[PDB]
Amino acid sequence: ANQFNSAIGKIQDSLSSTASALGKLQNVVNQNAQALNTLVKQLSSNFGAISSVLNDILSRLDKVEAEVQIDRLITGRLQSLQTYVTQQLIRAAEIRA
Amino acid sequence: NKCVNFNFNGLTGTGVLTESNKKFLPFQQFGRDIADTTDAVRDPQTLEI
Amino acid sequence: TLADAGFIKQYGDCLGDIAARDLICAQKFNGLTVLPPLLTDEMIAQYT
Amino acid sequence: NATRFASVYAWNRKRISNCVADYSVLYNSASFSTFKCYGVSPTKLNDL
Amino acid sequence: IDGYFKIYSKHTPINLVRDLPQGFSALEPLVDLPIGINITRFQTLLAL
Ligand SMILES: *[C@@H]1O[C@H](CO)[C@@H](O)[C@H](O)[C@H]1NC(C)=O
Ligand SMILES: *[C@@H]1O[C@H](CO)[C@@H](O)[C@H](O)[C@H]1NC(C)=O
């Protein structure tokens, strides 16, 4: 009993004092956050269009001269989603395991 | 406070406009969020934010 | 430390300052959403 | 409608500012062969 | 830059005899003008 009550005591003291104890769980929250922050950061890319902003194309070009620019942003943003969903699908398998 | 199709100076978009507390310095006209999307503007006629 | 749990982002905060300091309003505003787990942090504590 | 232009070698520049531009005047003129643009489409120039 | 010249500036009181102060502050813009010239060289101006 005294050895058990002491050991359950050290569990509190260890978790309370150290920074690292939950690192395996913090690393999941961090990877989930990082990938969403990256998927947002990707939206700022031109991919070779005259703007990263969809409205700044549609407010500067006509209904034909825009389509090539917009298709660049579609291709880049769609490949950004296929990357994210591949990362998260593969990651899911790690969490399942 | 209503959803609207705004244009300021050619910065076309869609949103609810609202009164800001962001301390824009006299030289500034737009303010941006992490995503590189505008989320504040100084109105070109009456210079409130 | 949690990057949200999908709870009640009813623009009472996500309109105003916190929309500038918190990444998660920018994620929301770009069509990325976080959804709650079925079992609450109280129900997992009950099963435990 | 400047009387005499500059030579291509010594090309002139004007700063145009603090004024309203109505490019539809220029585009609605028959006078031009050439009215070609590289980061905007001419009918949109008036909306901007 | 590319057919503009511009000035950024700040004022701060400090009590250091002959050295540039440890600390941090950033310079706000004060003017821009489109002089558009081949600058190479510069000098300062002062009074008795
Ligand atoms: C233009 O805007 C100013 C404020 O910047 C306003 O005082 C003025 O009345 C406006 N001009 C006219 C002709 O009303
Ligand atoms: C500016 O003038 C100097 C001195 O004649 C010359 O060496 C330099 O190449 C010039 N640069 C430009 C951009 O005209």
Residues E22, B19: Cα–Cα separation, whole Å: 38
Sequence-ordered strand ranges (E) for E1-48 = 5-9, 28-33
Residues E29, B25: Cα–Cα separation, whole Å: 10
Burial (CB < 10 A; 0-12, 13-18, 19+), residue D18, is exposed
Tell me the technique behind this structure.
cryo-EM
Helix (H, G, I), strand (E, B) or coil at D8: helix
Helix (H, G, I), strand (E, B) or coil at E22: coil
Short-list E1, E18, E24, E19, CA closest to E10: E24
Beta bridge partners of B38: B32
What single letter denotes the amino acid at residue C13? D
Q: Where are the alpha helices (DSSP H) in chain C?
A: 18-21, 23-29, 41-47
Q: State CA A53 to chain mean position distance.
A: 21
- Among protein residues, the one with the nearest Cα to ligand 1's atom 11 is B45
Residues B36, D32: Cα–Cα separation, whole Å: 40
Length, in residues, of chain D: 48
Select from B24, B25, B27 the residue whose CB has the most chain E CBs within 10 Å, as the one to mutate to test that interface: B27
CA of E36 to the centre of ligand 2 (A): 13
Phi then psi for residue B4, to 5 deg, are -145, 155
**CA-based nearest residue in chain A for residue B7:** A59
